[PDB]
Every structure is written in structure tokens, then in C-alpha cells.
Amino acid sequence: MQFSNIIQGACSAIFSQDSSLIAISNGSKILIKDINQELINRNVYSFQDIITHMEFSPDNQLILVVQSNSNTVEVKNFNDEQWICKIVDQACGLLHAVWAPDSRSIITFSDFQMKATIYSLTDKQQYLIKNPKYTDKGLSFSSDGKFMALAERRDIKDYIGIYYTKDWKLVNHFQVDTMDLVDIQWSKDDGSILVWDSSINYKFLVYHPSNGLIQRIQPYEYALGIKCVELSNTPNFVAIGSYDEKIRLVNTLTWKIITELEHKANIKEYSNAVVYREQNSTLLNAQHLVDRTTTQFVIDESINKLPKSQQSGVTDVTFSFNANYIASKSASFPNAVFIWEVSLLELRYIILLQNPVKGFLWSHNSNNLIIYAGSNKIYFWSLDGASVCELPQYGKQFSVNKVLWNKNSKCLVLIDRRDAIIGYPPIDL
Amino acid sequence: KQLQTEAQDLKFVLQKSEERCLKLQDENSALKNKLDTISAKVYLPSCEKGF
Amino acid sequence: KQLQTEAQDLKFVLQKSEERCLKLQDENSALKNKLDTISA
């Protein structure tokens, strides 16, 4: 791993769309680093405030900063320190904000689901939102970014407002047959809006943006379901992470379930199972005084049994590059990672960790699922069997409780508390 | 027999919880209406006190 | 087993439903305090 000094104060971080910049957030400041030059700063912004949200615009020109109990939204140009904008329309609150892609605007969410006034950064044009249901959740953009679907609530009913993002007009409003919208996804080819209901009904409502329902992924009425969902970047396969340790993999071409991928418990019950574990070791050669007492990611096939609320449900369903694998895991396996292999539609490369898993990231253009667990180690489901990137003494105690991974999958961002490691892992590829 | 009762009827209890959340959503809608209303006359001009 | 499973599936949904109600309850109290703050 090629990397810089531990960044002090890095309470959180985000990386840019083009992966060239990393924004580090300290409680009162944002530091921007150009990773390609070196992992060094280009600029720093400070605020006499508490930053709760940080976002890069998808051109990596502006940083969106949302301040806490101050209801303040600041937008600053990295490349123009003379362009400073603030949204202080505070009587209604400025509870949150997100960037609106190429519209050069901020959707700023007022409190109490009142308004999500869109504030143009070129001309304000403050169109009202008819009682937005949420801030980030429930707000999504079409694959081409032209349409936006917002979960909204009035008439105490959930419905989706479809807005044309270029003028924010409501263009395709529709009622959804939901109990309580959780989120909204768009098809990769925008031939549908995939609507994710409350976990109570286990259902997905598939609507054509122009006509209402196309299809429904059947509810079971009385069980929790649809814990999480993701779309492949291959034509479009949606993997519905249910709450019953199953993924309903669906070909969105026909909206049919390409079986159920079940986590089970018994590794031996998957016809193609391969099981690995992180295990205690000594260091790689030629290591010296750096000490030992380390671990390595190894195969250990002998292992058969793998280790309401956050129990049972699929915690993740992430598709790999070209979606041959699904990085999943269920809440029932605090210490293990499931990798589903498709086209087999069978479980393979089951990984046990030394401690409970915190999350996963597939590398773009590859696999090598990045597995992190707050251990000062990056574990990978290396395609070539196994890999562990030990983190160094810089930050010897750094846990890595959160991980970001650049789309230009060269740069890794590891976050713990007021602390970040920015680097270039075993990425020769 | 009681498990048949546990099943019979929590579909109903789910329905009663739905009535309660609707009661609350309705009250919140009324309060939201009050917020929009109060804002229309209070902040439309009082926003100037602020700014 | 058949019944208990359903029964759980029902309890599982009920607790999530209750949570919807609770955020609406907390909404309701915060909404009232906002209005009072505005009037005063």
C-alpha cells in the first residue's frame, strides 16, 4: 500500500466522481486532496460550525457542506475560492441537502417533510416540493439522470413524484401501492422505476415511468422482506435482498426470479462451496522488528457451519464487476461473508473473519472483494485465492470502521474516528 | 391452539397499527398544514426580521 | 413450526410498523414545538 501520513481529524471522508479527489471532514473543516499528484492537499475549507454532511458534485467542482443545528448549507468551488454560496433559508430548516447532477443545483430539504426546495446555483429558481417524504432516501435519479423519483407523502399516502430534472416539473406523478416507501431505484436502462416498499410487505413495485405498474415482486403479506436491493451493471439484474436470508435474483428483462440464493448455514450444503477464514499468522517475509501476532486470509475447508431487527435479513447484495458474483451476507452471520457465484447460482467463497464484518466493496473492474471489519486490515476475497493488506504502523491502531473505494479503483479510503488512511493498496492489477 | 391465535389475529393487529399510524400521519398532516399556513403569513414577511 | 414461523413473521412486521408510528409520534411533538416557537 503506497500512502500518506495519517490524516488527523478525519472524522469522515468522501471521494470524488472521477476518483481524483478526496474530501476529508474534520468536525470544522474540509480538506481536499489530489490523489494523483500525491496524496496531498490542494485546499482546505473551514467553518465556524459542525459539519454533518459532505458531498462532491459529480464534476468534482463544488463541495456541498451541510451544517448541523445551524441549518446551513454551504457550497464552495474548489477551483474558485471567489465563488461562495450559502443557503440560509432557515425559517423552515435546512435539514439536509443533496446535489442535483448536471442541473447545477442543490435539493435542500426543509424539516418536517415540508419542502425540498431546489436551489439553483446559477439562478435560485426555487420550485416548491409538494411535501417530500425524505431527504436522501426515496430520492433517486434515472440512469441518464433526466428523471427523478421522489418518495413523497400527502393525503397521508405514499406516492412517487416524477420530476424532470432539467426543469423540475412534475411530469409523471403516480400513486404507489405501498404501505410506506423505503426507497426508489431506476432501471439501468430506465425502462422502469423499481419501487422499494417497507420491509413489512416484502415487495417491489415495478412501474413504467410512463404508465404505472409493469410488475410486482410478490409480497408475502406477513413477513418482513426486501431488506436491501441492488442492480447489476450488466443489462440489468436486480438482486432483491430479502429479510429471510434470501436473495431473489431477478432478470429485469422479464422481471422473473432467477431463483433464490439462500444463505443457509451449512457450507457443505452448497454444491460448489469453497470456505475460507481469516486466521492467525506471522508476517510475510522478509519482515523484521515490525513484530508478528498477525493474520492471513487462508482456505479452511473443513468448516461447515458458518458464523427481528438486524438479524436474518440480507445486509447486502453488491454486484461485482460484470456481476458474476454477489457480495452479500446476512445479519445472522456477523462474522462471515457470502459470495454468490452466478451463473452457477450457488454459493462459493465463503469467508469467515476474525471479528464481525463491517462491510464490503467490490473493486471496480474486478472483484477482490474488499472486506473490512474494524481490524486495521483489509481482507480481500482475492480472485487468486486470498489476500490481506496489512495496514502499517502509521495508524497502527487505526480500525477501519468505514471504507470507501474509488471508482478509479486505485485509491482506498479508510475511516475510523477522527482519522483517515488514504492510500494505494496492492493495486498493481 | 394459541399459536393459531398468535397468527389469529396479528394481521388484524397489523391493521390496527395501520389505523394508528394513519391517525398519526393525519395529525401530522394537520400540523404540517398549520406550518405551511403559519409560514405563509408569518414568514413571508417575518423572514425579513431574519434576513 | 409452521405456525410459529408465521407468528414470527407477523411479530416482525408489527415491530416495524410500530417504529413507523413512533417516528410519526416524535414528528408530532417536534411539529408542535416548531409551531409554538413560531407563534412566540
For residue B2, give the 3-state DSSP assignment: helix
> What is the experimental method?
cryo-EM
Is the backbone peptide bond immediately before A286 cis, with ω within 30 degrees of 0?
yes
C-alpha cell at B17: 397499527
Are A79 and A61 within 8 A, CB to CB?
Answer: yes
Phi, psi (5° rounding) for residue A72? -125, 135
Question: Which is it for the CA torsion A205, A241, A52, A364, positive or negative?
Answer: negative
Backbone angles phi, psi at C38, to 5 degrees: -65, -45
Asked whether A213 and A281 are in contact (CB, 8 A), the reply is: no
The answer, for B35 touching chain A at a CB cutoff of 8 Å, is yes
d(C-alpha A70, C-alpha A233), whole Å: 39
Helical packing angle, B10-50 and C2-39, nearest 10°:
20
In DSSP terms, which residues pair with A207 in a beta bridge?
A193, A213
Whether C9 sits inside 8 A of A198 (CB atoms) is: no
What is d(CA C26, CA B24) in angstroms, rounded to the nearest whole number?
10
**Any CB–CB contact under 8 A between C31 and chain A?**
yes
Nearest residue in C to A313, CA atom: C12
Instruction: Give the dihedral sign, CA A74/A76/A81/A86.
Output: negative
Measured between CB atoms, does C35 come within 8 Å of chain B? Answer: yes
Integer Cα distance of A281 and A336 in angstroms: 19
Chains that touch C (3 or more CB pairs under 8 A): A, B
3-class state of residue C1 by DSSP: coil
Name every residue whose Cβ is closer than 8 Å to that of residue B48 and which is 6 or more positions away in sequence.
none
A105–chain B nearest CA distance, Å = 22
Q: Report DSSP letters for C3-40, one per residue.
A: HHHHHHHHHHHHHHHHHHHHHHHHHHHHHHHHHHHHH-
| Residue C7, all three cell numbers | 407468528
Neighbouring C-beta atoms of residue A344, cutoff 10 Å: 13
CB of A21 closer than 8 Å to CB of A405:
no
Checking chain B for breaks where C and the next N are over 2.5 Å apart, the residues before them are: none
Resolution, angstroms, 1 dp: 3.8
Q: Whole-angstrom Cα distance, residue A112 to residue A41? A: 38
**Residue contact A224–C6, C-beta within 8 A:** no
One-letter amino acid for residue A372 of the chain: Y
Q: What is the 3-state secondary structure (H, E, C) of chain A?
A: CEECCCEECCCEEEECCCCCEEEEEECCEEEEEECCCCCEEEEEEECCCCEEEEEECCCCCEEEEEECCCCEEEEEECCEEEEEEEECCCCCCCCEEEEECCCCEEEEECHHHCCCCEEECCCECCCCCCCECCCCCCEEECCCCCEEEEEEEECCEEEEEEEECCCCEECCCEECCCCCCCEEEECCCCCCEEEECCHHHCCEEEEECCCEEEEEECCCCCCCCCCEEEECCCCCEEEEECCCCEEEEEECCCCEEEEEEECCCEHHHCCCCCEEEEEEECCCCCCCCCCCCEEEEEECCCCCECCCCCCCCECCCEECHHHCEEECCECCCCCEECEEECCCCEECCEEECCCCCCEEECCCCCCCEEEECCCCEEEEECCCCCEEEECCCCCCCCCCCEEEECCCCCCEEEECCCEEEEEECCCCC
Mutate to test the interface with B, among A87, A110, A124, A156 (most CBs of B within 10 A): A156
Q: Name the closest residue on chain C to residue B14, using Cα atoms.
A: C14
Closest Cα in chain A, distance from residue C28 (Å): 9
Residues preceding gaps in chain A (C to N > 2.5 Å): 307
What are the cell numbers at A360? 464490503
**Distance between CA atoms of A317 and C16, rounded to whole angstroms?**
22
C-alpha cell at A352: 469467515
Q: A222–C17: do the CB atoms touch at under 8 Å?
A: no
Nearest to C13 among A111, A222, A309 (CB): A222
Neighbours of A347 (CB within 10 A): 25
Taking the C-alpha atoms of residue A367 and residue A388, their distance in angstroms, rounded to an integer, is 14
DSSP secondary-structure letter at B1? -
